[PDB]
Symmetry: D2
């Protein structure tokens, strides 16, 4: 499986080792993918969905707070756990992404998993509560979303599968049944390394791309969507962005970094559709500390000066754009069975390359 | 059961009917209450929890958008469904309140119930998604919160039990296991009728009171907590506010109304604790309209002028204070079994009356 | 001049030495007070107004960033400089408070004063811009506000007069012509010392009180406004809160602290009027650092754990309530001339004491 | 003067008659431009600055509230008047744009101008206050910003000059001394006409472009900044966006519209620089009503459904992009005198055409 850079698309700077969000130290990604092409008993439509889990500091025996910031570009979607991100500045545990009507079971399963996995924290006499970050995009065109196919066991499998190294893209995890710009969408990831004050830090992005319309699609500045008009879902009948970094940032700086994903999604053409739940979260793995109930009264934290941040912002925007394009390149056709209303095609690599060549952007 | 006014407490203005949130026409409240005093098999602590459901336009055959506004006073808690309240301006379906780790099952159950109840809307070819408003307070001192006692059936029972009329208070629904100001807490409700542009409207409040410390408790402006010092949970070892009105208000005005609940909770003494998840939602039942996919492109709406709103703001504040006190008066002692760490007592009515009398505030 | 504690009002905890915002080391307060009782040439109404200036790190030869947070409880007023407080986390220079239509001249004068006072910073080749924090309340009932009485020289005088030590209250600075709860209002201040993690800190408040209606007035929990009904402004025909602390807080924590001023203003009875511009700013004097253009790329900062903050929140609430009541106790009758529409009286001390005594609250 | 479309750039959709913000009926624009090439007495650098004024409902004898919404993308700049836009939902009077240190005099001059212009509203016995919307970008590289060249008379001249019709672009009004993408910047405008529900509406934008670095510049998706590398300000040694529409939108909807300008400024390449004060305001001219003190208690308003808004969001993004490019095309070289540090050149039209032609984007 070539990724976008392999096809000659003219991407943007130096990446971490795997060109993925796992290039940020300690962050692991796990997936559970459900691809069925016949309905379950009592249903009329097949289940194509899944769960994505991103866990920071995956080696720690205790949950480690990660400072974080959210940006709600267009709130037509769900992302739980953000009230204490906004006021307390951090979250604990994994980011879990699934389909819109699997939020509940994913939230329930994640709390249960945290109580088991971090038993020495939560199965004690301390009064602690868990508020996980669970988010979604809507796969009802290709998935039997009102059949609630994702179970507790499916979400635990994603959490138990978290790992470092290369990350699968395309039709996997929460991205399985997604559609972006009229083509097959799904999971995408990328990373960038930047130098800041004599040290090297990584910015990694993971997206669940389910947004945009064909006409808007722009790849490398070329209006590809004006040239590749066939097979759109419309003719036959949301985006979650997670940014991770090891740069030492505080909450107020991370809310600014998350806001940069607005430009990041704009790069491939969308003006931000009304029905698109476009919600971005950014977290840092720097400044490790105990949970509130075990911390000393004063904490010493490192924080970056703001002056040099333009290169970090550029890296974040570029990583989001490459993560979206990687999802489209990695995706495969889906649908077209007797139980489907549509056939969603993955963007054709040779036709893409040809259009970019005509506009002098095929590297 | 006498309520606060029945004991001579010096409350504030004219109430609707039932002096409850059901005084706002069409708003129904349902409860599922779980009170056990012996552990379930494999658990060590008893289950004392439940679910509260508040459903606007409870007669409608289709979900009716209700404009709304949220105020996160201190975000150490969860309230789902707020991203589209912020950007879209409204929510659909019920407000469901339970315990912290019951969010996920309550969310899952609510989406499933909505798909069944509003089958003519959701079991169609339309691409529609549901993002319910599910909130919580933490009952881990009296409840086996990591045993996940609330099931899907429990939440469906609360939803199917919604009704107009008098509302049960104290140890019921989501407030079953809650503690407030070191005394037994739980569910409380109150309402006010106001005249605006001649016209008569109601403001009703429902609270799940689990906040505050004994030392802070102020009732009718009297420092009761300084006089009633025994039995605190501390010596032995959050608040969700929902405001409903039929006044015709738009989202930006409803956000201000919800922010008035900050002063409302301040009335009984709290300075707003760090660990308290204090999140308030206000919604109007005016301006009924179809869902987005069935609406005409232009809607005609009525909105109040802002000049005469002080009387509405005062009624909101007063109703929140009365609802909190009503919860304490309705509450009953809980705990003290061989499986408990604490015995939480309900505030004693005669002792309270005596303290108020000493400061000239017993009416 | 007795302050509220001197009259036997039952205030709250241990104050710093001056019981004022200048108890926070290095914070200076300066005033310019204009009290005229005949109209200036071409005007019909007299000028009663002024400027209040609060300067953190008043010894420093260069401007020192102070982390800060704002809460807009009801935005019917102006407070400039908040965009970079929200995103950047801090502000530089003084907080300047005046009347509503004097914002512009105060802003202009403050920039000019900073360019002259910090000449080694601003009269260089560096590209630097200044965005001062200038706020207001509306003194149109007692002041010729459309006569623009405050000049550049008036604001420079306040800035040049900043000093530590005891702070004047009542009819002075920006508070000169203000009215609160139908009585004469104005400037008030108070402070609290708290122990946090084996260290001592101070929380100081300064308020410009111009809010509330007589009927709502509550002092020490007693409904004083129901007993002292005469001479209201109505019968004859906003609040800025600044909190300063030396506790090491980051911006996300300071926004929470500023939000606690909502309860602080609720303590004296207001439900938060529609026309009241109720805007609060909290800043810390800890974590001194250079300006952005002179900072190293990485900074080391100290930050408190959030667990023990309840005593800090309680001190902040109590300090706001005391600063408001101090403002009413220090104020003097104003108006009643042939050019006035009103005569605004200060609350009478003996009548106040008598009402408190009847409810058992006169210490 | 050819504008961007006249040079063959491949712009986007149908414009209104002037392709400017004055295509929204009743919106006037007025400018005061100060271009001096020798220092004023006692100064060392020349003054090149000015004022831009945008007045909705310019014919009205009384101020007419216009619902509006703001998006602070990166708050390193000032825009006054936003607290009541956020909570009250509207503003009155003009949007005035100038240089960073001219805020104060522009604010003062606008309040004074409104008192005179709307004398039947403000020179009465009513208690009314004015909180104008005054914004800025920083022209310190080309202008003697610490000389405070803009006077009260300069701002009154811009206000008195508001007019419909064609709008001047480039080195005029507040944009006079601005620099964008290392080329001369300034004022730019554009409009789009869209059909919504059988009715025709216009979206217009006006920008004061002072943002970006040369290397990021992208025009029509082409990386022009990589090809036109000479004369950058760096080698020699912020953006305010105003969107106006006649679509009937409420405040919560206008906040989303103003958020779309983030994608609009990302079209030309910036990732959003840390030092860039990028603040956007959107307002609607629909739903005319009286001021709060003259309104009936209930108002009837028209509001759009959200479903069809994607075409409006696209029009908004495209108009911001065209306005920024129009500002660069209209700009003229500035500086390079014995008193300057730099010579800022306007982008060369022929060179730009040549780079676009090479990538197949010259229409």
């Amino acid at each position: 499986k070539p990724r976008a850079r392999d096809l000659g698309l003219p991407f943007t700077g130096v990446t971490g080792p795997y060109n993925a969000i796992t290039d940020v130290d300690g962050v692991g990604v796990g997936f559970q993918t459900i691809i069925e092409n016949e309905p379950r008993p009592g249903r009329k439509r097949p289940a194509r969905s899944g769960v994505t889990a991103i866990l920071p500091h995956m080696q720690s025996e205790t949950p480690v707070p990660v400072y974080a910031g959210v940006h709600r570009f267009n709130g037509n979607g769900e992302m739980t756990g953000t009230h204490w991100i906004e006021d307390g500045g951090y979250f604990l545990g994994p980011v879990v992404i699934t389909n819109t009507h699997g939020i509940g079971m994913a939230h329930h399963a994640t709390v249960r998993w945290m109580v088991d996995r971090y038993a020495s924290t939560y199965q004690t006499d301390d009064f602690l509560w868990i508020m996980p970050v669970v988010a979604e995009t809507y796969d009802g065109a290709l998935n039997d979303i009102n059949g609630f196919p994702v179970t507790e066991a499916d979400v635990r499998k994603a959490l138990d599968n978290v790992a470092s190294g290369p990350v699968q893209e395309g039709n996997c995890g929460g991205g399985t049944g997604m559609i972006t710009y009229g083509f097959k969408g799904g999971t995408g990831t990328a990373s960038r390394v930047v130098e800041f004050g004599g040290r090297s830090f990584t910015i990694g992005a993971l997206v669940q791309a389910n947004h945009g319309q064909r006409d808007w699609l722009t790849i490398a500045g070329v209006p590809v969507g004006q040239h590749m008009r066939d097979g759109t879902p419309q003719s036959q009948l949301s985006i979650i962005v997670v940014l991770a970094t090891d740069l030492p940032l505080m909450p107020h700086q991370l809310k600014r970094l998350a806001r940069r994903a607005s430009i990041g999604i704009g790069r491939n053409g969308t003006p931000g559709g009304n029905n698109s739940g476009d919600i971005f979260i950014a977290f840092s793995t720097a400044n490790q500390r105990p949970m509130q109930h075990r911390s000393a009264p004063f904490l010493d934290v490192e924080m970056v000066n703001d002056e040099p941040l333009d290169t970090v912002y550029l890296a974040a925007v570029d990583s989001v754009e490459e993560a979206v394009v990687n999802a489209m390149i990695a995706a495969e056709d889906m649908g077209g069975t007797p139980f489907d209303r549509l056939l969603v095609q993955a963007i054709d690599h040779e036709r893409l390359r040809a259009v970019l060549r005509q506009y002098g952007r095929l590297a």
